[PDB]
């Protein structure tokens, strides 16, 4: 049994376990702000530095993982609250798409909304070009921001949101539980074969994006993670 | 949204929010001890007092719930470490089976291991009459202790174990993530149509049993839970 | 090499290996509760019955030891969390001080905080009379509860704590590593010449104390220990 | 508080968290063999892939760490049981010294026995060129294999050895406890200023070496580690 686990209650620059890409910034209170409020088409991403082996070709086993994180999104004057945050899994060479337009691409896909990642988005802006539902929502993304599945959700400015994700290797089920500020929970599950959509070694992280008129504060507050792969 | 949420960091007798059935006893630190070490075929069950409505006949909706709790099993001299604990959901009128033989029935089924409940078992004893696997295991029980699905597990004496459970209403998926002492996680998931196996209002809880030659300490250390049913 | 070694995963009354002093009591799960919540100025101490020879005037050799154990301090309604636990080493004839006021004396010193022992304290209440730091702390005591050195620490109600202590005869260094619940470790070390502070044979144990208003659950969960004295 | 922790009960090739250098090999039982028995001047090293930040120039704080590991050394016919294993800490660009002669350099130093590392050696061959004591021994190495301090020790072929290391940032004390097969423990402590001997970012690992006539099996069986650096 090969297990990877870490726990972040706050973050600090210089920590060799976290990689910053784009407009990412660490505030004085240890929180991570993903986008820069003064940039058009801002994109910020934070990844756990070490790649995690989610499956072995030698045994054909896929890993199971449990992870929880909390974030906060807050409105700012004049700009439209957009675009959202996405928790993703991508190949180890993952980088911000060249000529990224930000916005509804959430910093992980091209203009068509395509890319190489699996993820869970917290979408706060309805992009008709990517078939977004008409309300804020949570969706499961498999190589595209045109979600494979979505559930109505509500983003509340300033509210701390808690998320718990469980990926069960056997059934290949990815389950998500979002605990809203007011106590109500939102859930969504989708069968995704990680061994067929991603390489043996991947990277986990968070990404957020904005546009010219759509900008908001995107904060990643804490993050704990554990993956366990059977080796037999 | 109809939401039911509670959080116990310790328990105390008298708390009208919990119902004690059988040999249940509360230790000095608020831990609940399920079985009595001096009784033969001991059975102890703790339940949340208020009934939770998991589904509606009018709308046809089913609730989603997120729950985590930590427990502990410890060995006792001269007795085989058995039988184990089960997180269960049953009708509001639920009671310990009449003339229960404890042992492999986990305090939720008859002699055959049949009953009207749904639960996740943490079985430390292999009962061939219930087609138990040859090792410690986690199992999804639907109206019987002859698990619908099981997964190899290892119960460590004196170790505090943490469990997270997410039930998604849309997919009808019950996902279990077990964090063992050493860090490793064990997962199991199964599709269970609650709407078909239980009445609209049910009760949640834990149960554990022992027999003549098989007994061990069974403690529940904490319990948080939140469910949300959509009313539309 | 004279070696003394033991390991208690649980404790049962009557085990001739353990001496109870004061308000000690064993729970049904095998944990030793050190204080009584119903008594004013409560004191309890648990000692390993067979005295251990830490040095010898014949050779001049001092022994080295390695020991680890786990405890749990939990808050109770209406009382201030006080006063903490201490792992101590004392003369073989040691007893709870006459007219023990409990409190900041931790059950091992007089009203002035003086005594004849060497120990590591997990202090959860600040006593200005004994020059206690303003926060919970781990300390190295040498014939006084007015610690020779302290280190900020943080006690978490309900959390299981793990400690490892190493005493090296050649440098005469006493080292401690506290593994908090969340995974962080706290350390503290100090040069304490054991052969100049205690008789050739001493007893090892734990002690806890309460006051009029400060009372809390103090549980010793497990203890393992090894000493080795070179006989040449 | 910045904490790094991992736990290895076995090892497997492909794990992106471990780096192999030299003649390292993973056996079927998950154990790591460091040297190749058919090569003259064999050298094998295994490092935890991610660099650990042991101190911050921003705050001037040093990290505290607790680590335990177990190894086994076994004789083989015809060859002299040599040369030993060394648990070391070195700069992130650490590699096997070019033109390494293996042997008493233990794979971390040049012919003069110099290098850039801090470590704990389990030396099974007396090299007079490096001022080795005449018996097997445990020593603390600071930039050289001519140990700063050593303690007599005995290597027992085939015996599983358990080691526990604690480094306390405040006193800058490095303490080692070696639990031999027969129960006896050996200890050694030395004050080493890590912030004055190493760069902010380092790597932890194990190295073993042999020579033409001196070869033996060197196995690393398990390894757990936790470091915590205060960030304030
Ligand atoms: O208003 C929020 C959305 O903005 C969209 O981009 C805008 C752009 O910000 C604005 O400068 C004007 O050009 O029109 C564009 C298209 O409507 C993003 O594409 C969308 O995702 C939100 O950020
Ligand atoms: O005998 C074990 C030690 O060997 C020393 O090197 C030897 C070499 O193996 C042997 O062939 C002899 O000819 O010459 C060398 C010098 O004695 C190593 O130097 C020492 O580290 C041990 O492994
Ligand atoms: Ca969108
Ligand atoms: Ca059974
Ligand atoms: Ca005090
Ligand atoms: Ca040598
Ligand atoms: Mn979307
Ligand atoms: Mn079973
Ligand atoms: Mn104190
Ligand atoms: Mn040496």
**Residue of chain C with shortest Cα separation from D3:** C184
| Chain C residue nearest residue B11, CA to CA | C76
**CA–CA distance, A231 with A58 (Å, rounded to integer):** 9
The reply to whether omega before B188 is within 30° of 0 (cis) is no
| Secondary structure E strands in C36-129 | 43-48, 52-53, 64-74, 84-91, 114-123
Say yes or no: domain D1-232 is CATH 2.60.120.200: yes
- Subunits with 3+ C-beta pairs closer than 8 A to C: A, B, D
- Cβ–ligand 1 contact at A51 (below 6 Å): no
Number of Cβ pairs < 8 A linking chain A and chain B: 93
A→D interface, C-beta within 8 Å? 1-7, 9, 12, 14-17, 49-53, 56, 58, 200-201, 231
Residues 6 or more apart whose CB falls under 8 angstroms from that of C49 comprise C16, C17, C18, C19, C203
Q: Which of A9, A12, A60, A224 to mutate to test the interface with D (most CBs of D within 10 A)?
A: A12
**Partner-chain contact A56 D14, CB within 8 Å:** yes
Residue of C nearest to D6 (CA): C183
Q: Look up residue B23 and give its two tokens.
A: 């040999």
Render the burial of D110-143: b for 16+ CB within 10 Å, e for the rest: eeebebbbbbbbbbbbbbeebebeeebbbbbbbb
- How remote is the CA of residue C142 from the centroid of ligand 9, in Å? 12
Minimum distance, in Å, between the CA of residue D82 and any CA atom of chain C: 26
Buried-state track C83-117, b at ≥16 Cβ within 10 A, e below 16: bbbbbbbbeeebebbeebbbbbbbbbbeeebbbbb
Q: Which atom of ligand 2 is nearest to the CA of D40?
A: 9
Of D214, D215, D218, the one to substitute when testing ligand 2's pocket (max ligand atoms within 8 A of C-beta) is D214
Residue A103 CA, closest ligand 1 atom number: 21
Q: What is the rounded CA–CA span in Å between residue C6 and residue C225?
A: 5
CA–centroid distance, D63 to ligand 5, in Å, is 27
Is residue A21 within 8 Å of residue A15, measured between CB atoms?
Answer: no
Question: Ligand 1 within 6 A of A42 CB?
Answer: no
Please state, in angstroms and rounded to a whole number, the distance separating the CA atoms of residues C45 and D51.
44
Q: Which atom of ligand 1 is nearest to the CA of A101?
A: 19
Yes or no: say if C227 and C54 are a contact pair by the CB < 8 Å rule.
Answer: yes
CA distances for B122 relative to A53, B39, B86, angstroms: 28, 21, 6
Identify the H or E element spanning A67.
strand A64-74
Neighbours, chain A (3 or more CB pairs < 8 A)? B, C, D
Q: Name the residue facing C66 among D177, D190, D228 (closest C-beta).
A: D177
Ligand 9 centroid–CA C153 distance in Å is: 11
Instruction: With beta carbons under 8 A apart, name residues in chain C contacting A9.
Output: 182
Q: Helix count (H) and strand count (E) of chain A?
A: 1, 16
Work out the number of other CB atoms within 10 angstroms of the CB of residue B181.
Answer: 14
Q: To test ligand 1's pocket by mutation, which of A212, A215, A216, A218 has the most ligand atoms within 8 angstroms of CB?
A: A212
D110/D100 Cα distance (integer angstroms): 7
For residues C30 and A154, give the distance between their C-alpha atoms in angstroms, rounded to a whole number: 49
The dihedral of CA D219, D224, D230, D231: what is its sign? positive
Residue C90: closest CA among C171, C194, C166 = C194
Neighbouring C-beta atoms of residue A95, cutoff 10 Å: 11
How far apart are the C-alpha atoms of C202 and C92, rounded to whole Å?
A: 5
- Rounded CA gap, C21 and C34, in Å? 9
* Nearest Cα residue to atom 10 of ligand 2: D213
Q: Which of A75, A155, A213 to mutate to test the pocket of ligand 1 (most atoms within 8 A of CB)?
A: A213
Instruction: Point out residues after which chain A has a gap (C–N over 2.5 Å).
Output: none
This PDB structure is determined at a resolution in Å of 2.6
Structure obtained using = X-ray
Look at residues A80, A92, A159 and name the one whose alpha carbon lies nearest to residue A126.
Answer: A80
In angstroms, rounded to a whole number, what is the distance separating the alpha carbons of residues C88 and C100? 17
Token code pair at residue D37: 């028995």
What tokens were used for D96? 């096997």
CB-CB under 8 Å, B227 with A185: yes
Ligand 1 atom nearest A215 alpha carbon: 23
> Of B176, B184, B167, which Cα lies nearest the Cα of A166?
B176
Place of tokens 């040599």: D82
Select from D5, D14, D53 the Cβ nearest to the Cβ of A58: D14
First to last CA, chain C: 8
Q: Do C158 and B222 touch (CB under 8 A)?
A: yes
The residue whose CA is least distant from atom 2 of ligand 2 is: D214
Residue C73 CA, ligand 5 centroid: distance in Å: 15
């Amino acid at each position: 049994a090969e297990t990877v686990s870490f726990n972040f209650n706050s973050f600090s620059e210089g920590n060799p376990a976290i990689n910053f890409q784009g407009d990412v910034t660490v505030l004085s209170n240890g929180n991570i702000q993903l986008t820069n409020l003064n940039k058009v088409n801002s994109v910020g991403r934070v990844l756990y530095a070490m790649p995690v082996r989610i499956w072995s070709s030698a045994t054909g086993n896929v890993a199971s993982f449990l992870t929880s994180f909390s974030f906060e999104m807050k409105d700012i004057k004049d700009y439209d609250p957009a675009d959202g945050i996405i928790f993703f899994i991508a190949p180890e060479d993952t980088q911000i798409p060249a000529g990224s337009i930000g916005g509804g691409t959430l910093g992980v896909s091209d203009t068509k909304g395509a890319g190489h990642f699996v993820g869970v988005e917290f979408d706060t802006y309805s992009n008709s070009e990517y078939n977004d539902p008409p309300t804020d929502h949570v969706g499961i993304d498999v190589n595209s921001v045109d979600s494979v599945k979505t559930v109505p959700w509500n983003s509340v400015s300033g509210a701390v949101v808690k998320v718990t994700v469980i990926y069960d290797s056997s059934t290949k089920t990815l389950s998500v539980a979002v605990t809203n500020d007011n106590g109500d929970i939102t859930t969504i599950a989708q069968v995704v074969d990680l061994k067929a959509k991603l390489p043996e070694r991947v990277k986990f992280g968070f990404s957020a994006s904005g546009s010219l008129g759509g900008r908001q504060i995107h904060l990643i507050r804490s993050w704990s993670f554990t993956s366990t792969l059977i080796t037999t």
